[PDB]
Swiss-Prot record, chains A, B:
Biased composition (Polar residues): 275-282
Family: Belongs to the protein kinase superfamily. CAMK Ser/Thr protein kinase family. CHK2 subfamily.
Quaternary state and interactors: Homodimer. Homodimerization is part of the activation process but the dimer may dissociate following activation. Interacts with PML. Interacts with TP53. Interacts with RB1; phosphorylates RB1. Interacts with BRCA1. Interacts with CDC25A; phosphorylates CDC25A and mediates its degradation in response to ionizing radiation. Interacts with CUL1; mediates CHEK2 ubiquitination and regulation.
Reactions mediated catalytically: L-seryl-[protein] + ATP = O-phospho-L-seryl-[protein] + ADP + H(+); L-threonyl-[protein] + ATP = O-phospho-L-threonyl-[protein] + ADP + H(+)
Boundaries of the shown chain within the full protein: 211 to 513 of 543
Cofactor needs: Mg(2+)
Protein's recorded name: Serine/threonine-protein kinase Chk2
Active-site residues, Swiss-Prot/TrEMBL: D117 (proton acceptor)
UniProt source species: Homo sapiens (Human)
EC number(s) per entry: 2.7.11.1
Transmembrane segments: none
Length: 282, 282
């Protein structure tokens, strides 16, 4: 059974995925309750602190026999369900979703958060409409950013191991892992197929990724612009240092689209209509 | 002033280094009280759990306006004070101390603890005698060992960044950093001078270490055995994977010394004379 405290504020209903739809008793509004059976402390700590239109918001949390997390309900489900079994997303719909994913990831990075597990199944669509707001979820694997390397470097390396000194060159580029993921997500949305797979290949999945040699099927990509493909090429770079950042991506020719930037602002203000407190008129 | 609680159990006395000698009121025995002015939680968590004759033992802790740590008093001070200003340690005294440092570090590693800051100033001598017990201190920088890489690897790397997959090869060799430090400590004890320095050199300290090209002065090392030098060569290896472990070191020809292993056991049982509860005689 569900705990008394949760039962006191919410009316539990039909399952969504475990994730279940519930009704907030006070408001009669629908909510989503993610049950994480017995690190969730860190996920809430992050989510309570985080505030962006493209990042999921915690409404409430319950620490009982299991962990119960109350989130805003996403009527469109996962982005994964839109790309399954070679279901190709329309280029405009890709731009709109990607743009949001970039803003969302940029924000995380700004605030020292590395998602670490970005995938179509962690992106949620707000409505059943293709022109809708997306939201990033699953901060389970996320990391926070002062390095113990920095504390070490203040001292004289008389006793410091070489590898620690070598690690200095690479250091501070952990966030690049999220840009790789976005690159993989963008490839999936645009083509309908993944860039790295064990399907009809001899080469190991590890090897395709390490080499950065993605599976390019021309007939598929003929339907996709050079601008879109260029951006994928720029994010799917083996060297994290050379690999494009969210800021670099957001500045890319593909995203310099005034209609998409307009549609998102229009979707944004439409969501914010109910929340709007009267304005201080000059 | 010192807190009431600490004042209640201990009589504070003359400074040792901040570290001050105190007297346990119950026992009238001398103790050392390390004052760490306002991560100490982790250092105590480790030290309370740790139990070895060559690792410092916590007796008590006080969390007031500052952090007060009660430790067993080491009458011989730091190992650093024995090697300052080209003071060369006798080879036997090196073997004896090194052997203990190896046992101590091996134990840490066994229990998943990486010291991270091993240096002559973190090694304490029990008595003013050169044949004495040593103890490892300063667990401030120490790390504990399940990897978030291991949690990642359970999944399909479809979205995994290449660098994460590359990090797999190197992974699980963080403890090698302590073997480097022991190698640097052993060089210092044996020669009287450090292997890597900015004194009478053009080459950067980073560069000497990364290259692993230690400053070898033959006239100095003529007084030192080939067995001792070989061990230093084996620990001062740039590749952590190739670099000797504490077990490899403890198996080395230099440490297969029955008199040293005997002297340490004799020093050990002499310390344990006061603690000895009667034995269950068969
Ligand atoms: C897991 C983590 O977050 C969710 C989730 C959060 C907020 N609204 C939602 N609508 N549908 C889902 C799940 C069924 C896709 C969710 C599930
Ligand atoms: C700092 C960290 O530990 C100590 C310390 C711990 C136990 N006994 C000791 N005797 N002398 C010292 C200091 C003066 C060298 C210490 C100091």
């Amino acid at each position: 059974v569900y705990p008394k405290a949760l039962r006191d504020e919410y009316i539990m209903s039909k399952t969504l995925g475990e994730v279940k739809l519930a009704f907030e008793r006070k408001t009669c509004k629908k909510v989503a309750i993610k049950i994480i059976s017995k690190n969730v402390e860190t996920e809430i700590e992050i989510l309570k602190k985080l505030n962006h239109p493209c990042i999921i918001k915690i409404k409430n949390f319950f620490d009982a026999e299991d962990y119960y997390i109350v989130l805003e309900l996403m009527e469109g489900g996962e982005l994964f369900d839109k790309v399954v079994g070679n279901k190709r997303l329309k280029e405009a719909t890709c731009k709109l979703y990607f743009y949001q994913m970039l803003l969302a990831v940029q924000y995380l990075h700004e605030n020292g958060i590395i998602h670490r597990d970005l995938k179509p199944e962690n992106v949620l669509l707000s409505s059943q409409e293709e022109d809708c707001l997306i939201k990033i979820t699953d901060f389970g694997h996320s990391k926070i950013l002062e390095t113990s390397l920095m504390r070490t470097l203040c001292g004289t390396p008389t006793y410091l191991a070489p590898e620690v000194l070598v690690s200095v060159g690479t250091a501070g580029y952990n966030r690049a892992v999220d840009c790789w993921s976005l690159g993989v997500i963008l490839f999936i949305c645009l083509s309908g197929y993944p860039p790295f797979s064990e399907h009809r290949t001899q080469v190991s999945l590890k090897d395709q990724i390490t080499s950065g040699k993605y599976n390019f099927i021309p007939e598929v990509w003929a339907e996709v612009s050079e601008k879109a493909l260029d951006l994928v090429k720029k994010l799917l770079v083996v060297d994290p240092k050379a690999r494009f950042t969210t800021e670099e991506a957001l500045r890319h020719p593909w995203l310099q689209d005034e209609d998409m930037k307009r549609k998102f602002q229009d979707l944004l203000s439409e969501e914010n209509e109910s929340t709007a407190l009267p304005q201080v008129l000059a």
